[model samples]
Target: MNIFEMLRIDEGLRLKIYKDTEGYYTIGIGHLLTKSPSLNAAKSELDKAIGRNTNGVITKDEAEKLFNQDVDAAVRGILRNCKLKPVYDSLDAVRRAALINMVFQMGETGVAGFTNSLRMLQQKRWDEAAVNLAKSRWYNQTPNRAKRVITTFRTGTWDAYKNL
Candidate 1:
């Protein structure tokens, strides 16, 4: 599904610490401070992992590592759910990538709450599933990105990888 490439585009590659839209201290492609207990703790973890002070910035290698770690977390989150696992497995790479991207943004539980949408997706009712996604707070919160993701679902292609 070219997950790394897709995610790197969707979530910009940032080696320096910055505040996210929600105003939390974030670094390395939207790795939020909430991922750790605090900003200091997050910094410490990164420093230790990178084996350097890091100061305010990390390396591309380190950022890639952090990015993959989150993707793994999202993958596990999807597979861990009894209901979601089968649905996830039933999908093709493109559809699966769309769900993974959603999980990356909203977490497993958040994505899982889309019961009707998931059901539609599992049934391969692509248009209905996309419609369901469009009528959500997720779409409202980030309409551009949501539209791209929903298009991927609807088209069953790597449409999200088209622009940006």
Candidate 2:
């Protein structure tokens, strides 16, 4: 693998902050937790470099890059600390993928708050888990996307979800 791709494999790539294997707040290429000088040019300053790039300028390619890399790390995070627990370990591939999406959309902390759904998944009660998800605050926050993940939870497939 060449440079950035190799970097992705080694350091892991992401655009958001999430706990690493040791539960440290981390992001792209090992987080690079910078300690910039007070006078350093920040993100807003860099924004000036993108005169043509609008508010929603990230292309589908970049989204997918972030999606796969972040999702890979998220799935590992779910499995790592939990250590193949009753829930995730028991799930089929599709369910696991959906849960990764869940973690991606809502960080692990947010997903942890989904006790009802977690319990359902932990017990290998796939249908109940989807039902729980449908009625959850998570579902209400984004019904369309939730509906997509809900189907994956229920049917273990990726046929729906327009934006997911």
Candidate 3:
């Protein structure tokens, strides 16, 4: 089943599947009714907030407002352009999902922003890719996350927590 299908929203909330300000057509997850002025607007606003927070590539805080407007399109564009299956094929479902989550958080451009890392992966230089993956600024910030993904790539297992 598709990810959206997994997050079924009921019709009672007037929960139309509009794209968030970032452009991702995400269903409402949570919010404060008072802060939003109304449920619909709240959902829209919340989506933008979440999308910008998760996307985290843009430097301007004002860009947060654009999330609901363009998040779906942005995500779709990334998915369309990325060579995801090559990475997906090399890892198990859990690892693939985790890696994709990282890609989603970083955006394809942000993730692929590392040309050296991409080159290593493309050349099947597993050790070098693993090292590069762990050495990134992103890796330093998300050490545990980086460890999990790199371990998955290196050992073909999702047992990073156990190993560490």
Candidate 4:
């Protein structure tokens, strides 16, 4: 089963599918207990908290509104329109999931910026893809995260950089 299947929509798993002020549909992985320090709010609020904690930039609370209905529609649109034949033929589930995560973080246009890497992936040139992944602006900006994902892609094992 996929991650979404594992965490069914009816479950308490809060998956954010709409853009916050910074313009990204991000998933939140924490519980917000009512009357506790982290009282229940939208997923975007949790994402903003993560951003603020990591980057030291505070995001406004007004950006925490849930727009899951729109987000669900958008996800359906992506599934209907985005081509997946090449990706399906080339990548394993873990690698594909990681790539999808990357695509989610970066839009399709931004993800398409990895032209050479995508071509290498389509060709099943694993080492070449790893090299290209290392040389990317994504690597330069998020060295740790990029390395973790790329290592998983190259090794076919989740242990290489799983801590991240």
TM-score of 3: 0.48
Per model, state how many residue pairs clash: 0, 0, 16, 0
Worst 10 residues of 2 by lDDT: 37-46
Off by over 4 Å in 1: 35-45, 48-52
Task: Residues 1-164, candidate 1: write the lDDT tens digits.
Answer: 48777777777878887766556667787665455447787677667766789876988878888788899999999999976788899999888888899898888888999999999999999999999989998899788889889998899898567756
Query: What is candidate 2's CA lDDT for residue 131?
Result: 84
Instruction: State the lDDT of candidate 4 residue by residue for 1-164, as single tens digits.
Output: 33232212212233433333233333332122122232234433554545443221223232222223323433443355345336534678766655654554444566666778878877878888899878877788767667766876776666543332
The prediction achieving the highest lDDT against the true structure is: 1
TM-scores of all models?
Answer: 0.88, 0.58, 0.48, 0.53
TM-score of candidate 2 against the unseen true structure: 0.58
* Alpha-carbon lDDT, every model: 0.82, 0.57, 0.48, 0.49
RMSD of each: 2.3, 10.0, 11.4, 10.2
Best TM-score goes to which candidate? Answer: 1
* Candidate 3 wrong stretches, greater than 4 Å: 1-44, 47-78, 82-95, 161-164
Error of 1 at 20 (Å): 1.9
Candidate that beats the other on TM-score, 1 or 3, i.e. the better one? 1
